[PDB]
Amino acid sequence: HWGYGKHNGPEHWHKDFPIAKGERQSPVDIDTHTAKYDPSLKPLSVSYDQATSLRILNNGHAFNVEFDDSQDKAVLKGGPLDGTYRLIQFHFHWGSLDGQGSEHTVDKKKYAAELHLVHWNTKYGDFGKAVQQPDGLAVLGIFLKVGSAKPGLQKVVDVLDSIKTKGKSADFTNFDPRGLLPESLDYWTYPGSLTTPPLLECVTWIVLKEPISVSSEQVLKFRKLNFNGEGEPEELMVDNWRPAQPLKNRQIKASFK
Numbered sequence: 281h282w283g284y285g286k287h288n289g290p291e292h293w294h295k296d297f298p299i300a301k302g303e304r305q306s307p308v309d310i311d312t313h314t315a316k317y318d319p320s321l322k323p324l325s326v327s328y329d330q331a332t333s334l335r336i337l338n339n340g341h342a343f344n345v346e347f348d349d350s351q352d353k354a355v356l357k358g359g360p361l362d363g364t365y366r367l368i369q370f371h372f373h374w375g376s377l378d379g380q381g382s383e384h385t386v387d388k389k390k391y392a393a394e395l396h397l398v399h400w401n402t403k404y405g406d407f408g409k410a411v412q413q414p415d416g417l418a419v420l421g422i423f424l425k426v427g428s429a430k431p432g433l434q435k436v437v438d439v440l441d442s443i444k445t446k447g448k449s450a451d452f453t454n455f456d457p458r459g460l461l462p463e464s465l466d467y468w469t470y471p472g473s474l475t476t477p478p479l480l481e482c483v484t485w486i487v488l489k490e491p492i493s494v495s496s497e498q499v500l501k502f503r504k505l506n507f508n509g510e511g512e513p514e515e516l517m518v519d520n521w522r523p524a525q526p527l528k529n530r531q532i533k534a535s536f537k
């Protein structure tokens with residue numbers, strides 16, 4: 281169907297999803313000199329103490345670590361947000377080479393990968409209703425660079441062998457997403473979209489300034505995943521990132537000077 285290849289990749293998505301050419305598409309390049317420091321932006325509140333991970337799934341485009349979102353167990357508030365948003369899943373985008381893989385860029389710099397922690401606004405009741413609203417989602421984006429290992433990532437890396445191909449899932453309980461955060465919660469924010477079809481313009485993006493470091497071995501394991509299902513020709517799950525889209529009539533704000 282849509283994907284990341286030569287014949288079905290991002291430049292083709294507008295044919296099935298015309299919002300791909302819309303006014304608030306993501307990702308974008310973050311021009312750090314043009315972003316506006318906004319002193320009215322509050323610190324982010326990340327409350328992940330009671331998070332309940334359940335499962336990890338290869339969906340053919342990335343792998344999602346899924347959470348129980350039927351109660352306020354893992355929530356994001358504050359920052360640019362005016363409500364309570366519940367964590368539903370996180371996943372990554374990454375490259376075939378360490379020099380690319382992120383979706384957002386910073387002064388045109390591409391990082392090796394990018395983590396998206398996806399949350400939905402509880403005033404809309406469920407994720408499927410939230411994506412139909414302009415303030416439905418809050419996505420926390422975190423850049424990954426290759427250097428020292430991230431100890432909190434290793435449990436994810438080690439299960440990937442069990443979900444090599446599209447449609448495979450595995451039990452994945454007791455995973456603590458706090459182990460994926462950098463030290464600082466300084467962030468940029470702007471209004472945008474899902475970065476995969478259906479590309480809905482429902483996201484408040486919150487992109488952290490500080491990257492996390494992961495080891496070369498950790499990202500190598502991401503690159504052993506497959507886009508295909510079992511019993512089909514092997515297509516490595518790499519370069520599953522959408523490039524930067526036009527900023528159009530949007531302002532990126534910074535929580536820091």
Ligand SMILES: [Zn+2]
Binds near residue numbers: 372
């Ligand atoms: Zn994503």
